[model samples]
Target: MVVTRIAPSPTGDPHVGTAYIALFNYAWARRNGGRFIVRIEDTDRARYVPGAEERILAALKWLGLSYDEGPDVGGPHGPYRQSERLPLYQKYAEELLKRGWAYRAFETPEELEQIRKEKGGYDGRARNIPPEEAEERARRGEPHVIRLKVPRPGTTEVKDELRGVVVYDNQEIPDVVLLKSDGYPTYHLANVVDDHLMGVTDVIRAEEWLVSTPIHVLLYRAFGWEAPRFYHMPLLRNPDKTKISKRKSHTSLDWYKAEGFLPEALRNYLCLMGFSMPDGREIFTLEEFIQAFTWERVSLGGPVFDLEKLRWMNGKYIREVLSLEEVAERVKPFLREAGLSWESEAYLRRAVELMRPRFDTLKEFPEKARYLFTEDYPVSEKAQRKLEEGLPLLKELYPRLRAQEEWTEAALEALLRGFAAEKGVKLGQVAQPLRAALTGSLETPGLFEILALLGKERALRRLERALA
Candidate 1:
């Protein structure tokens, strides 16, 4: 069976690069009628962050990259999380040591660093160590790490799915450390062991790991297990052509969510990073991505994650494609969950009508007009002065506003304009205090429109609050 998995280390906020690779892995797996799995490679204990794993799952779920098997979800492969499968790695490491395919090196970190500097690299220095001296050091109780005994003077060729073929000379390759002195198997050892035992038929990841292919191939040969097919996807780069970093931009998946980008929009934008469907469609559903995904279409050049392009694509999805009713339906849950259930359907519909044109996300709509429902709008000292300057006209107009027969925008505007003329003041002089009183700010949409929305009862209550 064809199976692919995204094994991300839970070290920090889930990265956009992680999602970039995952979208392809998931789509490709589904394209071929295979299962996609989520594996938590939490082997690096020092870097592991609490809640990072949950964030990763949440981000992936938000993007609609639902896996068939995950660390949270059980599958035929049993413990999908690498942390839970440490015992399996230990067993494999022990087998290699027993069969003489790997050996323990008792070199201290300081000594190894000096040796590495002397030899300019690890290749000839360690592998050419006298057999007797190596065994003697192993006999001593000195702390050591297990190193894979790669066969010398041979070529290990990699048949890549994206790139044609890559050849590495075995003699130049160093005897890499398999298990650290701390008794933790390095990613090199754990990945090969897990992939072999779990029957993974293909391994696809970013091009940064391309250099590690030779080491993995050697390990497979040493263990007498077939290595999976390897394909390296291009990196997502910045505008300056550097590999994108979480620090450089708010590209972290969690950051995107917190910034109120729609999950579907984020995923759709990510899928357009390098590859595109034959139909020339920029936006795609998860089902469409899975059905039409092609590895061959992946570009060799590092694709730039352009923010402007993403915003434009988001507009296409939100405004050009989805109907306002559809937009309302999709965003209703967000509003209700945000404790905005007090708003009637009519109120919400009006809010959406006024705000959706100005917003790319439903999360933004409430934020823009939050002062309308919130109580704590302590006016800034400067704004208080602005309000006090207009207070003379406001005091006279407040009682008149209460007595007005109709509270519609036109009626309110006619009354306010008449009052402004009678008081020998500009409309803004009368409008500013009412704006602060009603909306608790110096600036907003038209006064009449806002007052109309506020209605007679709420407007009167806010006017009383502002006076006090």
Candidate 2:
């Protein structure tokens, strides 16, 4: 069975790049009828942010990337976190030492820094330390780390699924530390061991890790285990073409969530970052993407995560992908956050149907449509100025609007248009102030729809209050 997993370090906020990587891995697993898993690589306690793990899982779940095995959900290979699998790593580290594939390095931080100061890298002086003397010093509890025994002047070949074979020289690869002095496995040892034990068939990640794949390949060789297929995708980039970083791009996935980006829309956009659909269709469902996804469609060119394009895509989903009822339901929490509530579900549904084209995010719905839900809505200064501009026209239209019994949009729009004709003024000259008076903003949906939904009573009350 083909198995894949995402190993996220629980550090700070869950990043958009995490979602970007996870989306592809999840799609690949689903496309192959295989299983996907989530693994929390939390061995680096120093960088562990306490709540980051939960948020990482939450971000994945929020994006609808449901995995078969995860830290929350158990499977045959349980204890999915690296911290919980410490003993397994210690066991492997010991096995490698006995098999002469690894050695104990007794270099202190001071000694390592001194070496770097002299030669700019480790001289592998400790590799020459006799096993007996090394074990004697280690037995005495001397501070030391276990390093992988890489042959000097050696080259290891990495078979990348995307870029063909990549070769790395041993000198550049270095004798990386497998286990730290503090009895914790560094990321390399834990990652390789965990992937092997968990039966991960593919190692899919960003190109940033391509340099280190050689070490992982060597680890697999030392253990006499077949290495999983590696596919290092192009990194996400900024407009200037630098790799996306917090300093350059909006890195926090939570910010996207809190800003009201629809999960499906965000996921769809992420798919476009590196991969494209076979039919060249930009707008697609998750199911559709998975049904047609192939590794060959992935681009080597770094894709920029364009925020404007994302917003436009999200607006398209709000306008076309989701039903009016779905948009209404999604807007509830956002409306509630704005301290506004509608009289009925259908009422909010109508408001959403009318406003759907005007908004790209949920939070924007409440900001623009507060007048639909509440009587005491706060009018912006811009709208207030417009209200003043059209006060006389609004006063004249109010009596006519009240005298007319019909509450339909057709009736209201015609009455306003006819009144503008009688006064020898432009239709906007009459409509703009009325729109500002009723909705607290000139920028809104069809004015007649707003008036019709507000009903004769609330609509006239807003105008009467404005006139008063």
Candidate 3:
């Protein structure tokens, strides 16, 4: 029975990094046929956002990384939220105290200030309090905290799956607080307790938690329970090699959704961030990803989250992965949002098929193919540069085009090529100008596709409009 979970704090907007981590954990759990769970670690009240959990859960759900048990979905582990399970954490903290694996401290704010002024910091001298004396003061109703009884001069080690034999010096692993006077369990305490209680067998998370593993390792050992397997995945990074920050634009999962990046495309790219297929294919479905995933292929190097690369990969998805019908339906809202309309379902499909390969995101479809939907598209000065030479060609060709009645791409292309032949020039010399005149830009889909879809009526009008 293997169980894996991602515990996100309800603090702010769900981040791309959180989804990136969840993708790895979800894939690993799925590959093994184990339970994947979501635990909301909302213990820190100071940094809490009220609806943060909603967005966090929704973000994961939207990304298609579902959990078997979570705050959103009930399992045997009732109340999946840490804040809701405070008593469970507080109970264990007391257990650690009587077992001598933890101790009580009654440091007041004034005492801490005095220590900070004299010894420069509150050294762990309070750790020397005898169990009987500490118990007496705590029972006498003194305000205090529970701290882990980490040995003064010992070490903790973890067998991280990605990087084996991670050792932490005891001096560096200070006696961290487990329960505050406010009856709140800190992250280290709540995390270990929930994982053990919920049957979490693997602690796969970001590498930033690697340093904290010793604390968790100590907690697990102190509780006389075996620690779960740990795999600290490489942190996602910017091209500058700094860790991805919320301060950067487009780092939120909401941003990716709003920008029209397909969920499948984003997941595929995220899978590549940490792990790659043994066969080295860049584009694959989620099932294919689970079919071939292994921690051995996970790179320790921080993968740079290149935004442009995501756009390029998304375009690859639009062009290759999704079926033409799927692509057509997916782009509908963007066109609707742009206040554009097509005469029929058949008409919209025609536009989607032509514009699909040229666009990376949904919004881009409406922006790039506006000419197909409306008459008020802007023509660049460079397009005007093209027209100065192409005007004479258009003058000779419009009547010839409007005069003929054949309206298919094959017929239109042959006509235009032969017309270019008559003008003693290549196909581009005529086609490029026609593209600019019709679409108001140099970049566009096949000219014949446009000509056929737009029909002779509007096509002639656009050519004539260019003349004006």
Candidate 4:
């Protein structure tokens, strides 16, 4: 059975990069009728952050990428977290030591730093140390770490599904520490052991780890275990082509969530980072993506993380994909966050329907529709200028608007359009001021639609307020 997993360290905010890679892994697993799992590699205690594990899980769930096995969810291979699987790692490390595939290194921080400075890398000074002497040091309670013994010559070729065979010289591979002096397994050891035990058939991750694949391959060979198929995805990049980082981009998934990006739109956007749809459609659901995803479709070039394109795509989703009611419910949190309240669900839905085309994100819905909920909303400087220019015409048209028997969009459009015709002025001369008067902004949905949603009473009140 094909099995894949995303192993993220809980050291900071759940990054968008995590979600990007998870999307591919999830798609790959589901596409092949395989199992998708999430493993927490929190073995690096020093860099672990509080609440990060929960956030990481939450972020994945929010993205709708459910895992078959994880820290919270058990499977045949239980205890998915590396921290909880420490004994397995220790046993394997011992096996390597027993087989002469690893050695004990009693070097301290200062000693290792001096060695690194002198020899460029660890000289493997401890690789050939007598086992008795190492055992004697251990018996004396001296601290030590287990280091993998890299063969001194030849090249280790890593077979990658995406990039094919990548060659690395064994002499340059250096002796990697497998177990820390503190009895904690390093990431390299824990990752390999966990993948083997968990039955992960595919190791699909970001390309940043491409160089480290040789070490993992060596570990697999040393343990006499078959390594999983490796696929390194291209890294996400800034517009300048540099690797994406927090310093250059909004790297946090939380930021995207709080900014009110629809989960569907965000998932679609991330999927397009490396994989292209078979039909070349830009906006698609998770199901559509799964049906078409393939390794051959994934691009090797770094996908530029373009915010403007994402916003445009999100706008397309808001206007074309989401139902009016879905938009209403999704925007409620953003409205509440903005300290705005609606009188009723019907009113909220109607407002959302009218404003749908004017916004790209749920957060923008509340911003654009602020005038519908509150009369105290600020009018933009450009809107204020338009309001000033049309104040006289607004006063002349108020009484006619108030006299109308029906206040539907058609009725409002006819009333405004007829009045403009009678006055011999263009429709915009009348419509522009009315837009500012009703919405506190010149940019809004159809003026009549806004007027209809605002209702006769609130609409007249806003016009009266503008005249004041």
lDDT (10s digit) by residue, model 2, range 56-85: 999999999999887889889979888898
lDDT of 4 by residue, 1-468 (tens): 899999999999999999999999999999999999999999878899999999999999999999999988878897977888788888899999988889999989899899999999889998767998997897799999999988887789999998888788887697999998888998789889889989999999989999889999999999999999999999899878999988889989999999988888889999999988878889888999999988999999979988888888888888888878888889988999999999999888888877876788888888877888988988899998999999888889988987889989899889988999989999999999889988789888888877887678877877888877
C-alpha positional error of residue 95 in candidate 2 after TM-score superposition, expressed in Å? 1.7
Q: List pairs with backbone clashes in candidate 4.
A: none
What TM-score does model 2 achieve against the real structure?
0.96
Write candidate 1's Cα lDDT for 164-191 as tens digits: 8878887767888888877788989988
- Candidate rank order under TM-score: 2, 4, 3, 1
Candidate 1: count the clashes: 0
Clashing pairs in 2: none
Local error of candidate 1 at residue 166 (angstroms): 3.0
Instruction: Compute the lDDT for candidate 2.
Output: 0.89
Clashing pairs in 1: none
| Ranked candidates, highest lDDT first | 4, 2, 3, 1
Off by over 4 Å in 4: 403-427
Kindly indicate the candidate among 1 and 2 with the higher lDDT. Answer: 2
